[PDB]
Paper text:
For a precise comparison, the crystal structure of ligand-free PPARγ LBD under the same condition with butyrolactone I-bound PPARγ LBD was also determined at 2.1 Å resolution. Both the structures were determined in the same monoclinic space group C2 with nearly identical unit cell parameters and were similar to each other with RMSD of 0.53 Å over 513 equivalent Cα atoms. Compared to the ligand-free PPARγ LBD structure, binding of butyrolactone I to PPARγ LBD induced conformational changes of Ser342 and Glu343 on the β-sheet in that they formed hydrogen bonds with the oxygen atom of benzyl group in butyrolactone I and Arg288 of PPARγ LBD, respectively. In particular, Arg288 was observed in the alternative conformation, forming a hydrogen bond with Glu343.
The nuclear receptor PPARγ is a pivotal transcription factor regulating mammalian adipogenesis and adipocyte functions. The protein kinase CDK5 can phosphorylate the serine (Ser) 245 residue of PPARγ. The phosphorylated PPARγ at Ser245 is associated with the down-regulation of insulin-sensitizing adiponectin production. Butyrolactone I functions as a PPARγ partial agonist.
Author numbering:
A (entry chain B): 207 to 241, 245 to 270, 275 to 474
B (entry chain A): 205 to 264, 274 to 477
Write the structure that this text describes.
C-alpha cells in the first residue's frame, strides 16, 4: 500500500510536467539566474518589452494599468486549460459525475493559479510570458489605484509560500488535493471526491516526509496555506467587483469579454 | 498505434467538453422528437392560440412575428456564449493571438449555430425552450414577411445534414474544425490555426471511420456541408438588413450586431 502512494506521486509528477510547460525548477533557475529574461521596471522598459518580445498578453487590440490587468486575465484563461488537462490525469477524476468535474474546476482554478504563480515569484518580481519577461514588484505597485495593490497580496502570499521550499513533485500532489475539495458549492456526489482526496492527502504526506524529512510538520503547514489561498481568492473577487463598478475604460470587443468572462 | 491513440484522446477530450458546454445534446433532442417516452413530451405550437397557451405552459414587442424573432435572438446570444465556452476547451485555441480568437468566433459562431440547430430539427419543426416546446415548420413559414423566410433554409439544410446520421461525438470534432478555419478574413497568424485544424481533421477522419464504418466517404460528404453553412449565413445577413430598415422600432442584441458588423 506504501508502494501505491509512491506510484500515484510519480504519476501526478509526470502528468504535471506534461501539462505545465514552465516548472518551478525552471522558474527558479531563471529567477536566481543559473542559465536571460527581459526586465520591465518602468513605462519605457514596458514599451521596449512589447516592441521587442511581443507579449501576446499586451498585444494592442489605452492606459498601461488596464492593459497589464487585461494581460493577467488573458494568461489566467490559458492557465485554466493547463489545469483542466492536469485534472483529467488525477485517478478517479474523469469517472466523477460530469457536473461535479465542472464544479471542482470552476471553484479550484483560482486557488491553483495563485499556488503556481508563487513558483514564478520572488520578493522582487514575477516571470511573465513563459519566463521571457520579469516584471518588478515595485513597477506593479506603482500602477495608479486600484491596480497598484492587485498583485501585491499575491507577492506577500508567494514569499511566505516559497519559504516552505516545495518542489514540482510536492506541488503536483498539492494541486490535485485542491481540485478534489468536497466542500465546493453545488456538488451532487461528495463521497468519491473525498475518497480520492483522502488518497491524495495520504500520497502528499508520504511525499513530504520522504522529500523533506528534516521539515517538521510540513504537511500541517502546507494544509494551513489553504486559509491564505481562499482569502487571496475572496480578496481578488472583491477587487474585480470594485473595478467593474467604478472603472469606465475596461470595455473590450464583446466576443473578447465573453471569452475572458 | 501511438498516432491513432493521440487522435482518440483528442476525440474523447472534445466530446467530454461538448457535453459540459451544450445543455441540450442531439441524443436528448432525438429522444424528445422520437416521442417514445411519457416524461419528455414537448408542448407543440402550430398556431396563435397554441402559442398563447404555450406562454403559460413553458417557462421563458406585442406583434407575434416580433416576439418570436426577439425570443430567437435571446437563444442565439445564449448559444454564442455556449460555443465560446466550448472554443476555449479546444487545445491551442486560447494560446492563439487574442485578435485571431475574436476573428475565429466572429465568423465561426453562426456556422456552428446552424449545424447544431439541425440536432433540434426534423422535417416538421424545431425544439425550443430547452426541448420543453416544439414549434412547427408550417407555423414559422406562415409568419408575416420577411419573418416567414428566416427558418425555412435552416430546415432545408437540417433535413439533408441529419441524413448523415452524425451523433454528438462526431459533432464535437466537426464544430472544432469549423472554429479553427485559417481562411477567415483578417487573421494575423494563419499557420498555427491550420496546424490545429490539421490535427482536428485527422481526429474527425478517424472518428467517422471508427463510428460509421459502413458510411462511404462520410468525411468528404461532411466537409462539403461547410459550403451549405456559408450559404445560410449570407441569406440570413441579407434578411437582417431588410428588418433593420422595415422595423425601425425593433432592436438587434449588441453581441449579434457586433458579430455581423463588417462580416464579409
Amino acid at each position: 500500500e506504501s508502494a501505491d502512494l509512491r506510484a500515484l506521486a510519480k504519476h501526478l509528477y509526470d502528468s504535471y510536467i506534461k501539462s505545465f510547460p514552465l516548472t518551478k525548477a525552471k522558474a527558479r533557475a531563471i529567477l536566481t539566474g543559473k542559465t536571460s529574461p527581459f526586465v520591465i521596471y518602468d513605462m519605457n522598459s514596458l514599451m521596449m518589452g512589447e516592441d521587442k518580445i511581443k507579449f501576446k498578453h499586451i498585444t494592442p487590440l489605452k492606459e498601461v494599468a488596464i492593459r497589464i490587468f487585461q494581460g493577467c486575465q488573458f494568461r489566467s484563461v490559458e492557465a485554466v486549460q493547463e489545469i483542466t488537462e492536469y485534472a483529467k490525469s488525477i485517478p478517479g477524476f474523469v469517472n466523477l459525475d460530469l457536473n461535479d468535474q465542472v464544479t471542482l474546476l470552476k471553484y479550484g482554478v483560482h486557488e491553483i493559479i495563485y499556488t503556481m504563480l508563487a513558483s514564478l515569484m520572488n520578493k522582487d518580481g514575477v516571470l511573465i510570458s513563459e519566463g521571457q519577461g520579469f516584471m518588478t514588484r515595485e513597477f506593479l505597485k506603482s500602477l495608479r489605484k486600484p491596480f497598484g495593490d492587485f498583485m501585491e497580496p499575491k507577492f506577500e502570499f508567494a514569499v511566505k509560500f516559497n519559504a516552505l521550499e516545495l518542489d514540482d513533485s510536492d506541488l503536483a500532489i498539492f494541486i490535485a488535493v485542491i481540485i478534489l475539495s468536497g466542500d465546493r458549492p453545488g456538488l451532487l456526489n461528495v463521497k468519491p471526491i473525498e475518497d480520492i482526496q483522502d488518497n491524495l492527502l495520504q500520497a502528499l504526506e508520504l511525499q513530504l516526509k520522504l522529500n523533506h524529512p528534516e521539515s517538521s510538520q510540513l504537511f500541517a503547514k502546507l494544509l494551513q496555506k489553504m486559509t491564505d489561498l481562499r482569502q487571496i481568492v475572496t480578496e481578488h473577487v472583491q477587487l474585480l467587483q470594485v473595478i467593474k463598478k467604478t472603472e469606465t475604460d475596461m470595455s473590450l470587443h464583446p466576443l473578447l469579454q465573453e471569452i475572458y468572462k
